[PDB]
Amino acid sequence: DSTGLIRLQELIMAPSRYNIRLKIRQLPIDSDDSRPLLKEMKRGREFRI
Amino acid sequence: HVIRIGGIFEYADGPNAQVMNAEEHAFRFSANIINRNRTLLPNTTLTYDIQRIHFHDSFEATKKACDQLALGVVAIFGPSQGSTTNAVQSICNALEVPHIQLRWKHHPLDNKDTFYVNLYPDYASLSHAILDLVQSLKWRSATVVYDDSTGLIRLQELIMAPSRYNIRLKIRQLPIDSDDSRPLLKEMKRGREFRIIFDCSHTMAAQILKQAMAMGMMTEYYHFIFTTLDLYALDLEPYRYSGVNLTGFRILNVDNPHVSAIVEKWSMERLQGVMMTDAALLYDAVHIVSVTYQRAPQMTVNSLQCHRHKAWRFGGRFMNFIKEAQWEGLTGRIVFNKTSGLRTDFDLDIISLKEDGLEKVGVWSPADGLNI
Amino acid sequence: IQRIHFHDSFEATKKACDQLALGVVAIFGPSQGSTTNAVQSICNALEVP
């Protein structure tokens, strides 16, 4: 949820301060299967999460 | 017959304020049309009770709602805020009586209710509109420019959206104690982005207009879009003939002479007035409920008590009648997403300022996407 | 000691002033917003921390 992202929005203007990239990944809220998200980041090949 | 409804009006001094604003006048003027309509409540006298309230006293509205509940009214216009209304629908779900939203509020993460509609539009369907055009405009370096973290709540589906379209979007909020972009207009000068959409109230945005005015940011290179709706009561024409690329929106179906008429009729009434989108939707919200009541079976709202727990007989019955109300008004047709019982039937007049004036250049719908 | 449902204010509508008609000297309201939006507004009203 973005209610947590209210609280650490100031970590998100740090890419607006100095360059660091990011991927916005929400937990599946209409379900509980994050393996679509786990495979999509497996396609993303990301290691800093 | 004589019928009565309930009224709630937030002000700073609240009831101690004497300001009939636009919405307080459009309450009574919307009643005065039905008072002159035999086409709606033909012999039923439409009366009301207004309980003007301050901001965020939950004990005031605790007393204030059960006043009109001991009365018993047939319409509960919900509060503008979201904090106190947590109890109010918790009161409305308690004694079998429908409750209405006027704005966006956050959605319950523990329960799911029965007495709820949202004539206010849908932000995910707004992100549908955003992806129809920004991808069509190929805008790829932008910045979330705003002051509302509530805006960061409601368009996070558009923050999930960079997975099929590339746009480099940054995150910039105003100094929250003020309305200042004079550092920020140097920051976007150093941000070199000529294509940005803006998430704030037109109250503060008219100041930010004057901020970009003194920062000389009024050029057609700055191909921007806004998100607000009511600006014709504010400045346009130096910003117009400066030469800019900018786009506003309008839910109000200004195609009919009737829609233009009700606005122009309204436009002389309030002192320091032309139609607001709140007064337009309040006009529609008044003119849905009494249509739903004139078609309703015999149901009188019981004098319920807040020292008791008595429930009115026809609460979910008339909530069914509210969720099946499909009255079309000045803002196009109103029908509810029956997966949620909430209104997502809204169409965007894609209106864009050029030096001649504001000009509608297309539509957005959730059945066309963009249609130019 | 009181108890209410999750996301329910009509219970604590009584149960707050059950402790006020009692008289309590500290309200440790829940970690829920929609509860304490009703509660601490009135704690602000009738001089209650």
- The DSSP secondary-structure symbol of B17 reads -
User: Is residue C43 less than 8 Å (CB to CB) from chain B?
Assistant: no
Nearest to B111 among C7, C33, C38 (CB): C7
- Inter-chain residue contact B143 with A2, CB threshold 8 Å: no
Query: Among candidates B331, B261, B235, B279, which has minimal Cα distance to B20?
Result: B279
Asked if the C-beta of B143 comes within 8 angstroms of chain A's C-beta atoms, the answer is: yes
Q: Determine the residue type at C1.
A: I
Q: Tell whether C20 lies on the interface with B, counting CB pairs under 8 A.
A: no
Per the structure block, which two tokens stand in for B111? Answer: 């329960």
User: Measured between beta carbons, which residues in chain A are less than 8 angstroms from residue B153?
Assistant: 2-3, 6
Q: Is B58 in contact with C35 (Cβ distance < 8 A)?
A: no
- The answer to whether the Cβ–Cβ distance between A9 and B162 falls below 8 Å is no
Spatial distance between the Cα atoms of B314 and B302, rounded to a whole number of angstroms? 9
Asked if residue B142 lies in contact with residue B168, where contact means CB atoms within 8 angstroms, the answer is yes
**Residue in the block written with tokens 């629908």:** B89
Query: Would you give the distance in Å from CA B326 to the centre of its chain?
Result: 18
Long-range contacts of B217-223 (CB under 8 A, 24+ apart): B217/B185, B217/B188, B218/B242, B218/B243, B218/B244, B219/B243, B219/B244, B220/B244, B220/B245, B221/B194, B221/B245, B222/B194, B222/B196, B222/B246, B223/B137, B223/B139, B223/B194, B223/B195
Neighboring chain C residues of B83 at a CB cutoff of 8 Å: 33-34, 37-38, 41
What is the DSSP-derived secondary structure letter of residue B101? B
Burial class (CB in 10 A: 0-12, 13-18, 19+), B205: buried
Among B57, B60, B86, beta carbon nearest to C9? B86
Resolution (A): 9.6
The verdict on a CB contact (< 8 Å) between B171 and A16 is: yes
CB distance B142 to B195 below 8 Å: yes
Q: Please tell me the distance from the alpha carbon of residue B229 to that of residue B314, in angstroms, as a whole number.
A: 37
Q: Which two tokens stand for residue B78?
A: 């919900």
Exposure string over B142-157, b if 16+ CB within 10 A, otherwise e = bbbbbbebbbbbbbbb
CA distance C49 to chain B (A): 15
DSSP state of B197: B
Site of tokens 């901020």:
B211
Which structure tokens are listed for B107?
A: 């959605």
Which site among A2, A18, A30, A46 would you substitute to test the B interface, given the most B Cβ atoms closer than 10 Å to its Cβ? A2
How far apart are the CA of A22 and the nearest CA of chain B, in angstroms? 11
Helix or strand (DSSP H, E) at B205: helix B202-214
The count of residues in chain C is 49
- Say which of A6, A25, A40 has its CB closest to residue B152: A6
- B84, B108, B109 member nearest C37 (Cβ): B84
Distance from CA of B345 to the nearest CA of A (A): 22
User: Cα–Cα distances in Å, from B342 out to B116, B122, B349?
Assistant: 8, 9, 21
Neighbours of A46 (CB within 10 A): 11
Q: Report whether B162 contacts A24 (CB < 8 A).
A: yes
SS3 state of residue A25: coil
Rounded to whole angstroms, how far apart are CA atoms C8 and C32? 10
DSSP of B218-254: -STTSB-B------TTS--HHHHHH--BEEE---S-T
C46 touches chain B (CB under 8 A): yes
Method: cryo-EM
How far is it, in rounded angstroms, from Cα B319 to Cα B98? Answer: 6
Rounded Cα gap, residues B36 and B308, in angstroms: 38
C-alpha to C-alpha distance for B156 and B149, rounded to whole angstroms? 11
CB neighbours of B150 closer than 8 A, spacing ≥ 6? B104
CA distance to B118, B160, B251, B361, B362, per residue, from B370 (Å): 24, 21, 14, 10, 7
Secondary structure string (H, E, C) spanning B248-310:
ECCCCCCCCHHHHHHHHHHCCCCCCCCCCHHHHHHHHHHHHHHHHHHCCCCCCCCCCCCCCCC
Neighbouring-strand partners of residue B173: B146
Q: How far apart are the C-alpha atoms of B335 and B223, rounded to whole Å?
A: 34
